[PDB]
Design a protein around this ligand. Structure first.
Ligand code: PLZ
Ligand code: PLZ
Ligand code: PLZ
Ligand code: PLZ
Lengths: 440, 440, 440, 440
């Protein structure tokens, strides 16, 4: 791999620097206080494994803007395709005047998603819009209303995706009333419930059948790895068992692969590790090299249930974002990012080999470049305090680490798949020393 | 020459051509059937007043991708900003890692929107997300639940924005159950109701007070000109009276300026035309020269009600889109597109001089580059059939014009503000001869 | 007719009397403050046309406990049935252990309700429970979700019946969120809209088709005379046209006859006056001579759509209340209360011959023993102050008169059908003298 | 005690007898299919522990009309009170014309319910109406929206109370969409979860804090013993801890004592067995000796939050039902039915000595005259088939047994507290012989 900016960490004695401090004051004056960014620097370049700020700091990027910049934040093929497309046209609204890159991205998605059955796609802008439209096609197809979601789920910040999201603070509180006919089932969380995949599936199926009923249920929606919920990997056989139940009970099984999709996990989709074939898949984030695109891909007969003009949105499938995605997907093949994702896991597990020694480390989990540590206290309760402290410390040392978890006690690793081995190991070494410092 | 592509209409004997025909069969196999595009040609350039298709046809663009490409479909300042931003970084997620263009776009919105009170902004991707977030800050600020919307309203295709949208077909049907605590009031539709502004407002307030109650009501949401509902302009005084009632009753007044904003009506915001000062204003479409961007701008105290992390979305305020928006807004100022919008209204009214001679034309309405004609039968009832036939005849002659209206009987005009006078006149002459041909 | 207590009005200069004042002190200590009884006397007897209080006052009853004690408040046949049933059994729960009086009352309702098609009934306690169960059998039967109700409607105080009710204060305010998928259509209110029945029906059907869609709609629910809304009588042909549209569009037409049913209007059901044949009819109030009973009666195939145990309620079709209802219906037949209700309408219109002295009287409307006066001010606006003054003056003079109306400007007349002519004329002469005095 | 009808079991070889068969044919013609009664006889008398049918059969009553006829089916003091009251007046509507027996029942409830704090009451007809009004006062008082309920909960058959009810079949299926802002927490079901009281409460509270948030929550509603769900008695300490959490979090703790109240469990309120003092308590069933009455009793400040007219219902607090209830409550005191309940428990545990052995019997549980057996197969899975067969076998031998359970595998015992000991022992011996016969 060749890089445009230096791939080495460096932070000044005073962070933020003066230009970033100035931009932070403008942000306080102009921007809703809810938008409280974590990085103590204003980005001017994102390339390989580095975020470069307005003051010359270079932060190691283990965030990829939350699993979005899988191909890098400024991949040359993506930037070239974006520039070229904008010079031809930025927008026509596909429903009004169509264009080839929309159709080409639908074909790409139909080809890359699990299963050999006939599939169709529809393109939107945000992950929340993709989840909303996945619910729309399932309701239109089944003629049934209810939506089943899981403990620890996250599906977005719209009224319905807030209902589907498990965590009240800060995603839901004060924004209700929320969309009705949404029902929640227990998740396979093996660290906490010690259940096998099939046992966890029996428990979930028992709730859904007792409390909801197949005859009322359009869809069951699950993240094959739960993201904001804490990189929760279900026990083997769990997802398969839920998919089988949905097929037997004429319920649409929807995999939300917005975070887990496009090689993040070392497979094209996380569904592939257990060879689960979802009826419908939502994608976003890594799809378009950072440009705003999302998609719903599914069985042709499900995707065709809505009538003419029944799905839409002005910007959906923006031609510049579609050109970006076509360029990014080809990069993923050409640069063998699937093998890089697999190598990223090996390196993380290697650098975390000493973490067993720490009574605060409950579990190391995930797949490919979607890995996490869960942190606990002396009595085994979630350790959100320590999680926050370790992330703030890493940050002061020039490493951007994200937290998540139902209980706020999970450090996640989301490096871009183009990060240099040298840069990744430096990043993971800073994390382990910050964990040493905060527990010692 | 002022334009990249020729600014003259040309359609072949057979449209679609074989390239567009081959693309339509690819669309049929790969894309959900709900997305049935209107233009019989696949777009390769959008520049000035023209859409060029893959077969060499040139259509006059009186759509601007539904009031999005105000500054033209491939504006050179927009294309430059987009290419340059993508080469530095496509995305960081503002909530994680901040950047200047997000802050500058909030500053620009705060400055350009009505009122000299303290304002803050939050950026998202689609118009529906912007409306969803306007409701969220109104609910967070008031501690009240209910939402009031109007007859003929359109607000988007999410679960809450469908509830907020008036027309069932095709936007809402089969997608329920929809978010509750949404109440609908009668609209000032002077052609149909014959009411003064103050009278229509008294009627709307009487329904709100009787059925909803201020003590239950977070917000009143209205388009200052109703777009999809038929370019409905409320009677003079209506918006002020509703604005006054909200202030007197602790209810947030929200102007949906997604279609009517950014000089579309010959003012910066349609609200300006009666110096109404909304508490909160939603923007999208024309804001970013075709890139996916939307915004909520309001009174600082309303925008800051949500807590840290309580508003968000991965892509919102994309740096490539914010770069495009800063460029488009500079073009609006520097090319004085405000005057171009006023001249466009003059030209539209001038070419429609002889529409007096048509009993089928009920009304010519709107302002600037947001103009419409409502078509009726011999009884004075809506004539959707004539509306569709005129649109299809115009398309066959190489002019793209859109239709809308609760009853499907409104031809709307949404030229880009950079359209050449000769191109606009040719487009309008084709529309007038299509109406002549189709009414005999 | 034979009476148990004296049938002449006699009310003290000072009311409440001492025994009623002491009871009111106990009420204030023990009963939720929302229950604020109007009559300045504690009832010890209700017989014929009279409410006798603890202090010996005899008030003329033009309320019949809100259209409930149609056969009188202590009919000797009803009283004897109630005594006799309770000494056999008070209760078994019909769906556990059945009993003949439940079945006999289902047969009575099947027979007395409009239409010659096969009908079945289910019995509950309150009118709200009967409206809830009418919606349940329509949803079960159609497999569709939405519910259509009208301006000025009143259907009860449960979560769903509050949503169905139009007026926020005091019935709905503060008790949300309320059941979703409830849509409101405009009412035929001839005094205000000037529309023919067919014109009002076209207007309502336009809203329902535009905003709801038959494909989403289980049922249309309307009171054939709107009770709490102000004894609104739709223009001739309105109910027929709505019933026709429901038949043509596979939507269940539900008549709410809770107030209007059981000879209140001089027909068995107010639907009879225009030969309308509802799919489903809700009854309560006058059905059981004051005992708590309600009923859903409908097409056998609609009533049978719910499966075994899918409808219920512990008390529903209480054997004591059914014994009361069979006795009350036998009185209605034996005492020819149908003719009495027509004579009561004639006596009311006779005693109101001079309301032409009053520009405050906008309309006299209703049928049988369901008659009303709407009051306006000198500018033609609703006159709730005069309405409340007249009712307060009447009570003080010893006449119980209820008020109602969306705008609180309607005096209603709901005398029991067993009222003596001399008692009714005294009552009406008091009302007319109260109107002369409050306007004079 | 003194019985009006012979207290010995007698059934013919063939049931139903012929009068009951003629009545069942009339029911099938006239009554909605959902209301398929279980007893193979039409009831003519209910007295002591006997249901006498139209054909001379005498069934032992282990049902009491689902926990309603606590004082017997035709108690002489209740029957006399009902006859005397009906002969004076059946109904006035308390909120129109008040009467002493409504006030006297509010005083009785204020005095009998847990705690010494100031209380007020409101009277309705059904248990579901009481739960609906408990939610209404909790929302009015808190100004918060959400309702927490538990797994296995049963609260009624209205839109909101169905939402609050856990089990889909047959109570909820096909009747949505249901009222929103209802959240479910896991229940203390020690047999199934092997959890302690304290653990179970922490588990429930973790869900409520994480998914709902106190700042959004009006009320927590729980049955102190879960009736339809399977007579689930929570582990000791569970209810206390939920009550403690609600007081610390400004959330209203509503105890649903509709089935468990008025001495059924051998305390006045099942809450008493743990010194829990509910903020609000809902009662019905046993309150009025089989007459239709329900009540909401709570803290005066909570009960007074709704404004004048904001709670209501035509029939609520019917004077005949209040007379019945005042007579029933005097019988409970004067005949020491509290001791009769404690004695019935001893008799049930005695006759069950040669049961709890049977491997198919998982648990005997409950208190007083609220006792149940849960049945399993060889695997330990729920045994609904055996449950149905035992109950069918018992009925044919002249004993009325109800079943219940989330999984349909619970035989419940609800004798009237006036049953003779020899009648109860005969009934329980039939149950054991039926279980012996049906376990092949
Ligand atoms: C699985 C899964 N589904 C859906 C979504 C929603 O995608 P949008 O593009 O953020 O709307 C996400 C977005 N996750 C990032 C959350 C960050 C924040 O906003 O707090 C996801 O992870
Ligand atoms: C006023 C107003 N508010 C909100 C929206 C929603 O904007 P999104 O960007 O399409 O979500 C719009 C979108 N305009 C109609 C789009 C046409 C279609 O999709 O069928 C609007 O006009
Ligand atoms: C048409 C119609 N449908 C339904 C209902 C509901 O009947 P319930 O028996 O009061 O529940 C009514 C009750 N009308 C009197 C309510 C008075 C009050 O409570 O303030 C009605 O009139
Ligand atoms: C705890 C609890 N709360 C509330 C209720 C509801 O009381 P209503 O009087 O039946 O409405 C009940 C009614 N229980 C019997 C239901 C039988 C059936 O109808 O299937 C209860 O047990």
């Amino acid at each position: 791999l060749s890089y445009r900016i230096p791939q080495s960490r460096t932070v000044a004695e005073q962070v933020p620097g003066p230009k970033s401090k100035a931009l932070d004051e403008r942000r306080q004056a102009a921007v809703a206080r809810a938008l409280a960014p974590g990085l103590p620097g204003y980005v001017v370049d994102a390339d390989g494994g580095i975020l470069a700020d307005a003051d010359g700091n270079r932060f190691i990027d283990l965030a990829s803007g939350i699993a979005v910049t899988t191909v890098g934040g400024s991949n040359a093929a993506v930037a070239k395709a974006v520039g070229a497309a904008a010079a031809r046209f930025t927008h026509t609204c596909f429903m009004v005047s169509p264009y080839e890159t929309y159709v080409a991205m639908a074909e790409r998605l139909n080809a890359l998603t699990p299963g050999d059955h006939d599939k169709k796609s529809a393109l939107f802008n945000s992950g929340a819009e993709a989840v909303e439209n996945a619910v729309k096609v399932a309701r239109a197809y089944t003629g049934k209303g209810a939506v089943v979601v899981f403990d620890n789920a996250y599906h977005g910040r719209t009224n319905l995706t807030m209902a589907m999201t498990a965590k009240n603070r800060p995603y839901k509180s004060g924004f209700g009333p929320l969309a009705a006919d949404v029902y929640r089932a227990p998740m396979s969380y093996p660290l906490r419930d010690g259940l096998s995949g099939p046992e966890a599936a029996e428990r979930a199926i028992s709730v859904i059948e007792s409390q909801v009923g197949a005859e009322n249920l359009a869809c069951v929606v699950i993240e094959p790895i739960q993201g904001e919920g804490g990189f929760i990997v279900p026990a083997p056989g769990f997802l398969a068992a839920i998919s089988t139940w949905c097929r037997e009970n004429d319920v649409v099984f929807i995999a939300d692969e917005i975070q887990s999709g496009f090689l993040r996990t070392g497979d094209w989709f996380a569904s592939d590790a257990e060879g689960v074939i979802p009826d419908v898949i939502t994608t976003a984030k890594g799809i378009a090299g950072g440009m705003p695109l999302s998609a719903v891909t599914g069985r042709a007969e499900i995707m065709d249930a809505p009538g003419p003009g029944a799905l839409g949105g002005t910007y959906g499938g923006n031609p510049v974002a579609c050109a970006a995605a076509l360029a990014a997907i080809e990069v993923m093949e050409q640069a063998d990012l699937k093998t890089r994702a697999q190598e990223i896991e090996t390196i993380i597990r290697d650098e975390f080999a000493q973490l067993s020694a720490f009574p605060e480390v409950a579990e190391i989990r995930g797949r490919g470049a979607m890995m996490a540590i869960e942190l606990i206290d002396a009595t085994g309760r979630p350790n959100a305090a320590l999680t926050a402290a370790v992330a703030a410390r890493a940050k002061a040392e020039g490493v951007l680490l994200l937290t998540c978890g139902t209980d706020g006690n999970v450090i996640r690793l989301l490096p871009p798949l183009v990060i240099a081995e040298d840069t990744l190991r430096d990043g993971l070494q800073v994390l382990v020393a910050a964990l040493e410092r905060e527990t010692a």
